[PDB]
């Protein structure tokens, strides 16, 4: 995400800006607000104090999320098998605004990064699949020789 | 190695070259799942694939509906997206921040129990005196509560003390008060409440009763029911990478990730100071107290095709008013968009009835005045400048007679003297008119008791349209 | 032709000659309201006044007593 | 009825309209009004504060017809033996406007649905019936032979 | 390129499911390239098996409202069925030779054609109502 | 395009100038008729060039039975970014949309290279903000055809429609300007729906 430019000068150094743009506004002391609340998942053991207040903009916000180090350890239900009572903890590492989505969550769940797996390599199979029509002429091959087929799918 | 034979015929990857161990693994899955039923056609495959994934999104996104929406996870969602709510509307270029201060609700009570004073606890520390009792330090405006008050005691002492921290900083404390504070335990049940004004007149409220009558409750507003952060995921609305994520949202409506409005009302203290740099512009649908864009999820529902309220109850006008006068700031949506409105910013203060003389009933109009904290905020940025522009002063060579001037040619740019002014007059300019009396102390000569009197514009609330028909005029 | 059919046939397919009729393109919407007749002035014995009744919710609050 | 179409694109996409077309219009807030009145055939426990208002348009009439489930259940007269004193109670279960026509009140009638059965095995027999003569010729061996024919009757 | 103007089946229709299959995927192809797609139905379609016994029939409308044909019956009910028209009995395409009348070169071969009418080069019709399209 | 019109739009039409025509051709017998060699290897269908405008290609779709060609979008590989559903979001999206599309980058790489000769030359003159405001709005002004229907050699010959220009300074080295061109160009015909139907009356 980085436009090709070139290197400044008594020239002039035209890039396109694939963007649009916005603008900007100042005043004296800014209405400061401070926002209090729980903004982690535990009770830290510092006196108030002693602990700091982060500021935070639009351009600091996910170096404020990341530095914050919101860890989230908790039993959920196991949906995964046959089993209603069955529990699984999950373990989360959240650094980016991006990582509340179940793209980041589900990779930080090593029982989910074996599922993503099997469905990207499901995705892998059905472009070659329809194309060649002799993959069906092996999957009888497959149902005949039943050995060497238990054999490999082990490996 | 006839699996070897199957990538060699695969003439696309067959030389060893790149993605040939990914392929590999999905031709070893395919099988291990395929005796379940037997069946050789490569575009009934390409069903029997796309068969493999659906069941295969029933066992993943049962689980992603469980992974979130946890009390743990949804409560630490709620308090930090809303976060980013309040970041991304807010405009930084416009002399704006924000800090941010990681506490505990339970913490708090204890850090007030822990100092013998208010003006010694921890939380004074950040609000009053690394802010505003500093030296060049930039002045708290507002304290946002990301807390779900009960009318319990250990949170009626915490608003008693916060109260008196908002009187000496001059920064009201928003926050709100949760679906328990009316004693409903499952909050889309408040519009079936047929007697507002009975409830809070209950023992149970005798910690909340005297809390409103207490003079230092001027700076404290308690906002709104909730408000909807997430759009539930959709593979067609909002995709995920990769991935079909369909989220289940079930009937009940705390898997939604409901946000706290003290985000949502201090999104309008600043909006508005972005604009005119003050803020009493708060309580209009078209004049600064609309909140608008927020997530909306068009489901179906018996039969028909409606959306989820953004705010979780649809506040009536008869029930925003009940609340207006027992000191809450709601939030009325707007029934069948993305929008809402505030309507009057009333603090929990309560109107002090004076008795029926001359001055008794002009003061109860002054009173009055007070507690509907639109107007605090006028006189907080005149606590802020003030305190901050007679900072610099000390040591100078000033007389009573320059300490007259130097704040009546200060307050007079902020005073339009006018009946009616154009309508950005009104507001960079939010004073009417503001008197200076600067009086001496003595025994220690030269101290300064004078006395700013500022009087603000008067916004339009309610009235009558009385029809008839005259039937010749 | 039955006393339980008829009577909850024409307050239905007669529902069908107002929504058939009605151009719902030209800015019309219609509600529909499952009460009965005898819960319907029970439910105003329910109140003690108009202005806090069942059917107040649907006709004044949630319609025309609302923003938006 | 579902014309066949093409795959949308930027070259054009004729689709013969067998259709004719009809028009629409807009407004403020539309002319609500609002139906009340006795629209099932029991008296719902609810009450009256808490029930909801669905509404209704052209589009959508068919689907608000169906989640209502009208399950219309009342004891009427048996006409279908010699007894006048003979009542049967039916069961019916409304998911169309089609629903209230004969056709599919007799499908929901296990009594009628035997007598529809009966008539369409009797349309069925009407096609060949005069078309081959040798039909009569054999009714006459099941007039010679009784025996055989009673035993495959009951079959 | 020149686009398909309509489409020649030169089929003989039965009303069983691969037939009826078959024209519910050529009504929907007929509807996408605006091409009616004509052919023509057998003698056992209308349950005959034998042609010459049409004029026969002494109630053609019966036939056609019996349950062997409920693919049939509700395949003219489809909307994309308007691209399917299913064409005449059969007709003739080669004279039988004859030593007199249409000779061949250096031999005489009166074709012996029997009772049978089975024998004559009967061709199918979709030939011939397309002749009616181009000309 | 540029020898006719001294710009390059006009890239993307059958007849209005995507047109590769003069193609040779290779008249050979089939199997049994008589037929043509193609001239580009495949004959690109409607729906395969559009799923390749989609995935970013330049495809050739081919006359076929002649010795003509057509180009119909000449959309470059990046993909067109969805944004959120914001009054904004809904916005950019359409305008970072136009960015990808290529006939529209040589109206502004146009604007690119006109640019930095036409300033580089003033390089040592005797301006003001003012001045570079007014030698680059009476510039541009020639290129701008603000109209809602010009003839079809204006909106060629002036390819842009309106054009923002707004300089700025940079403070604690003066005399430095960072102004913002902003060009908008004409938009050309993509697809429509044809729905028909028959009245009767009507």
Redesign the interface.
């Known amino acids: 995400s980085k436009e090709g430019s070139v290197a400044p000068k008594e020239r002039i150094n035209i890039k396109y800006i694939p963007a649009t743009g916005d603008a900007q506004a100042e005043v004296e002391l800014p209405l400061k607000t401070l926002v209090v609340g729980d903004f982690k998942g535990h009770a830290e053991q510092t006196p108030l104090e002693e602990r700091a207040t982060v500021t935070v903009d639009k351009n600091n916000f996910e170096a404020v999320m990341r530095e914050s180090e919101l860890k989230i350890t908790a039993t959920v239900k196991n949906k995964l098998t046959d089993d209603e009572n069955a529990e699984l903890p999950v373990e989360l590492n959240f650094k980016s605004l991006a990582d509340f989505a179940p793209d980041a969550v589900a990779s930080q769940v090593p029982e989910l990064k074996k599922l993503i797996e099997l469905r990207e390599a499901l995705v892998a199979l059905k472009g070659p699949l329809g194309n060649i029509p002799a993959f069906r002429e092996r999957l009888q091959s497959l149902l005949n020789s039943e050995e060497s087929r238990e054999k490999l799918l082990a490996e | 190695g006839?699996?070897l034979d199957?990538i060699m015929?695969?003439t696309?990857c067959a030389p060893s070259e790149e993605?040939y161990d990914?392929?590999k693994?999905?031709?070893?899955?395919?099988?291990?799942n395929?005796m379940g039923s037997?069946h050789?056609?490569?575009?009934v495959?390409?069903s029997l694939?796309?068969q493999?994934?659906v069941e295969?999104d029933k066992?993943?996104s049962?689980?992603?509906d469980?992974?979130?929406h946890?009390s743990?996870?949804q409560?630490?969602?709620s308090?930090?997206?809303g976060?980013?709510l309040?970041?991304?509307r807010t405009?930084?270029?416009?002399?704006?921040?924000?800090?941010?201060?990681?506490?505990?609700?339970?913490?708090?009570l204890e850090?007030f129990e822990?100092a013998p004073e208010t003006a010694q606890s921890?939380?004074y520390?950040?609000?009053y005196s690394?802010?505003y009792g500093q030296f060049g330090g930039?002045?708290?405006?507002?304290?946002?509560?990301?807390?779900a008050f009960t009318p319990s005691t250990p949170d009626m002492k915490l608003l008693q003390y916060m109260g008196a921290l908002g009187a000496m900083a001059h920064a009201p404390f928003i926050s709100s008060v949760g679906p328990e504070f009316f004693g409903i335990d499952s909050f889309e049940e408040l519009?079936?409440i047929?007697?507002l004004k009975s409830t809070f007149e209950s023992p149970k409220y005798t910690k909340w009763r005297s809390l409103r009558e207490s003079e230092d409750a001027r700076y404290l507003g308690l906002t709104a029911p909730r408000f909807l952060l997430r759009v539930p995921?959709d593979p067609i609305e909002n995709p995920?990478?990769?991935?079909n994520?369909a989220e289940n949202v079930s009937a009940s409506h705390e898997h939604y990730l409901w946000g706290?409005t003290a985000?949502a009302f201090?999104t309008r203290?600043?909006d508005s100071?972005?604009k005119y740099?003050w803020?009493p512009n708060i309580i209009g649908?078209q004049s600064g107290g609309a909140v608008e864009?927020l997530p909306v999820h068009v489901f179906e529902?018996?039969?028909?095709?409606?959306s989820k309220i953004p705010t979780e109850v649809?506040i009536?006008?008869?029930k925003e008013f009940e609340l207006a006068e027992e000191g809450f700031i709601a939030l009325?949506?707007?029934?069948?968009?993305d929008?809402a409105?505030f309507f009057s910013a009333n603090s929990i203060q309560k109107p002090k009835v004076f008795p029926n003389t001359k001055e008794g009933k002009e003061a109860e109009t002054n009173y009055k005045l007070g507690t509907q904290l639109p107007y605090m905020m006028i006189i907080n940025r005149l606590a802020?400048?003030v305190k901050?522009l007679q900072r610099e002063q000390i040591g100078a060579w000033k007389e009573r007679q320059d300490l007259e001037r130097e704040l009546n040619s200060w307050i007079k740019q902020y005073v339009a003297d006018q009946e009616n002014p154009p309508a950005d007059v009104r507001s960079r300019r939010p004073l009417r008119a503001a008197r200076i009396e600067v009086m001496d102390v003595e025994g220690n000569p030269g101290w300064y008791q004078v006395s700013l009197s500022v009087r603000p514009h008067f916004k339009y609330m309610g009235a009558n349209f009385e029809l008839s028909l005259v039937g010749r005029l």
Chains 1, 4 share one sequence.
């Open positions: 006839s699996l199957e015929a695969q696309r993605g990914i392929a693994k999905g031709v070893a899955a395919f099988i291990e395929l037997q050789s056609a490569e575009p495959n390409k694939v796309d493999m994934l295969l066992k993943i049962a689980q992603m469980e992974i979130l946890n743990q996870f409560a630490m969602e308090a930090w997206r976060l980013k309040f970041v991304d405009d930084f270029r416009e002399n704006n921040k924000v800090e941010i201060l990681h506490v505990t609700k339970d913490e708090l850090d822990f921890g939380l520390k950040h609000v690394a802010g930039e002045p708290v405006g507002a304290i946002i509560g990301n807390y519009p079936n047929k007697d995921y995920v990478k990769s991935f994520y706290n985000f201090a203290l600043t100071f972005a740099r803020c649908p864009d529902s018996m039969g028909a095709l409606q649809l009536t006008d008869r009325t949506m707007r029934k069948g968009s929008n409105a802020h400048y901050v």
